[PDB]
Design an enzyme around this catalytic site. Structure first.
Site, short mmCIF file in Angstrom:
data_model
loop_
_atom_site.label_atom_id
_atom_site.label_comp_id
_atom_site.label_asym_id
_atom_site.label_seq_id
_atom_site.Cartn_x
_atom_site.Cartn_y
_atom_site.Cartn_z
N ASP A 181 6.31 -6.36 -10.20
CA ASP A 181 6.25 -4.60 -10.37
C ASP A 181 5.83 -4.59 -11.82
O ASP A 181 5.28 -3.45 -11.97
CB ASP A 181 7.64 -4.14 -10.06
CG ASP A 181 7.57 -3.76 -8.34
OD1 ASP A 181 6.99 -4.37 -7.85
OD2 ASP A 181 8.78 -3.17 -8.16
N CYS A 215 -6.42 -3.84 -5.46
CA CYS A 215 -5.06 -3.27 -5.43
C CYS A 215 -4.63 -1.81 -5.20
O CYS A 215 -5.06 -1.54 -4.22
CB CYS A 215 -4.52 -3.87 -6.93
SG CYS A 215 -5.17 -3.07 -8.23
N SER A 216 -3.85 -1.23 -6.17
CA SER A 216 -3.70 0.43 -5.72
C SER A 216 -5.01 0.69 -6.38
O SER A 216 -5.67 1.53 -5.69
CB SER A 216 -2.45 0.55 -6.59
OG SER A 216 -2.05 1.87 -6.14
N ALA A 217 -5.51 0.58 -7.68
CA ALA A 217 -6.84 1.16 -8.30
C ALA A 217 -7.99 0.41 -7.88
O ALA A 217 -8.99 1.01 -7.94
CB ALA A 217 -6.54 1.40 -9.75
N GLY A 218 -7.83 -0.73 -7.73
CA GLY A 218 -8.96 -1.67 -7.36
C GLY A 218 -9.67 -2.06 -8.78
O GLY A 218 -10.93 -2.18 -8.71
N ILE A 219 -8.87 -2.64 -9.97
CA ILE A 219 -9.49 -2.76 -11.06
C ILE A 219 -8.80 -3.80 -11.75
O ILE A 219 -9.12 -4.65 -12.74
CB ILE A 219 -9.87 -1.55 -11.97
CG1 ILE A 219 -8.22 -0.71 -12.28
CG2 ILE A 219 -10.83 -0.62 -11.46
CD1 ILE A 219 -8.41 0.35 -13.49
N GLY A 220 -7.37 -3.62 -11.63
CA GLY A 220 -6.53 -4.40 -12.61
C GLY A 220 -6.34 -5.99 -12.02
O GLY A 220 -7.03 -6.80 -12.60
N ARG A 221 -5.38 -5.93 -10.87
CA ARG A 221 -5.17 -7.33 -10.24
C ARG A 221 -6.66 -7.79 -9.89
O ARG A 221 -7.08 -8.99 -9.63
CB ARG A 221 -4.17 -7.42 -9.32
CG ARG A 221 -2.96 -6.67 -9.97
CD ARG A 221 -1.76 -6.49 -8.94
NE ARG A 221 -0.61 -5.86 -9.29
CZ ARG A 221 0.49 -5.35 -8.68
NH1 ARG A 221 0.44 -5.88 -7.21
NH2 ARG A 221 1.46 -4.50 -9.08
N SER A 222 -7.43 -6.78 -9.08
CA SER A 222 -8.63 -7.10 -8.71
C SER A 222 -9.61 -7.75 -9.54
O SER A 222 -10.27 -8.62 -9.39
CB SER A 222 -9.04 -5.66 -8.04
OG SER A 222 -8.43 -5.19 -7.01
N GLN A 262 -6.62 -4.26 -16.72
CA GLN A 262 -6.23 -2.68 -17.44
C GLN A 262 -5.29 -3.12 -18.55
O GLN A 262 -4.89 -2.02 -19.33
CB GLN A 262 -5.07 -2.12 -16.35
CG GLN A 262 -5.57 -1.64 -15.13
CD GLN A 262 -5.03 -1.02 -14.07
OE1 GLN A 262 -4.96 0.17 -13.77
NE2 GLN A 262 -4.01 -1.96 -13.53
#
Ligand SMILES: CCc1oc2cc(S(=O)(=O)Nc3ccc(S(=O)(=O)Nc4nccs4)cc3)ccc2c1C(=O)c1cc(Br)c(O)c(Br)c1
Length: 282
Positions: A181, A215-222, A262
């Site tokens: 988290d 992911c949520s935004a599709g930038i960080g973990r992605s 991010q």
């Protein structure tokens, strides 16, 4: 290993934040005119996470081809990715239309449906075999065929049917369920395992359309997923493996979608993942 020595230098000098800010400053800036159109307001999850017009994925439907998704084309590594946001209640049909139309084999999910007690994306796939999903707006049917729940991730076999033509395809859902988290994993072990399990399935291979990553935004973990994959692929291909510059590869990727990676913490982890992935290869 050249990039490991750089990694350790940044750690000693504690300059992760400064390196990350430099990348943020050098990052490409392209228009997102379609994304910003008032009629597409309800098709975006975050106000600050939009697809560039030039690399956006277009739905093959007349009138509103919009979906918050970008095609990341890595020429050298000969690999393509579609990064997208976690589907919204109203964009689940769009999401699978894209999967169908782009001839995707795999869908990579790097978040849990609920994290930090909030909903991070819609329940866009069937949880039970006998309870299939129909998306009336895009005329598609989705059936859970099988589920394999492992320690750090879950693999699902899904059958996606085009109701118009009765054509069906097998889709592989790779769901990484153990991203914390807050912050990043302590060890890249499980993430790298996951990445290579995705690789194993053929979902990232040239004989299929681009993998759909979110992911949520599709930038960080992605970003971490794609970046590590590409860097490792490049190290295998090149005559000089030490020439692979993760910052340059990430800047290259940012021409296709904004905000990949991010935080400085994510950048550090990306390095780690590439470094540890290399040492395993070896
Ligand atoms: C690059 C792939 C990969 O990289 C990893 C790194 C780790 S790690 O974070 O714990 N780091 C690590 C762990 C061990 C070593 S090691 O070199 O000392 N041991 C081995 N290397 C190759 C085979 S056994 C070096 C680095 C764990 C697991 C993996 C692993 C895999 O999960 C994985 C690898 C392959 Br190849 C594969 O086909 C699949 Br499926 C999974």
């Amino acid at each position: 290993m050249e990039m490991e020595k750089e990694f350790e230098q940044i750690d000693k000098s504690g300059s992760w934040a400064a390196i990350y800010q430099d990348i943020r400053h050098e990052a490409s800036d392209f228009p997102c005119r379609v994304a910003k159109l008032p009629k597409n307001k309800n098709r975006n999850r975050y106000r600050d996470v939009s697809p560039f017009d030039h690399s956006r994925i277009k739905l093959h439907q007349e009138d509103n081809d919009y979906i918050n998704a970008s095609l990341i084309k890595m020429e050298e590594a000969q690999r393509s990715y579609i990064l997208t946001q976690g589907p919204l209640p109203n964009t689940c049909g769009h999401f699978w239309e894209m999967v169908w139309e782009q001839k995707s084999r795999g869908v990579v999910m790097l978040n849990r449906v609920m994290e930090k007690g909030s909903l991070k994306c819609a329940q866009y796939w069937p949880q039970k075999e006998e309870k299939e999903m129909i998306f009336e707006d895009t005329n598609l049917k989705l059936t859970l065929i099988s589920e394999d729940i492992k320690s750090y991730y879950t693999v699902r076999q899904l059958e996606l049917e085009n109701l118009t033509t009765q054509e069906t395809r097998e889709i592989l859902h790779f769901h990484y369920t153990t991203w914390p988290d807050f912050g990043v994993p302590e060890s890249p072990a499980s993430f790298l395992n996951f990445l290579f399990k995705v690789r194993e399935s053929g979902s990232l291979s040239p004989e299929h359309g681009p993998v759909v990553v979110h992911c949520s935004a599709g930038i960080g973990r992605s970003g971490t997923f794609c970046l590590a994959d590409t860097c490792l692929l490049l190290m295998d291909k090149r005559k000089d493996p030490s020439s692979v510059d993760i910052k340059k590869v990430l800047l290259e990727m940012r021409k296709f979608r904004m905000g990949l990676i991010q935080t400085a913490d994510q950048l550090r982890f990306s390095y780690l993942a590439v470094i540890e992935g290399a040492k395993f290869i070896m």
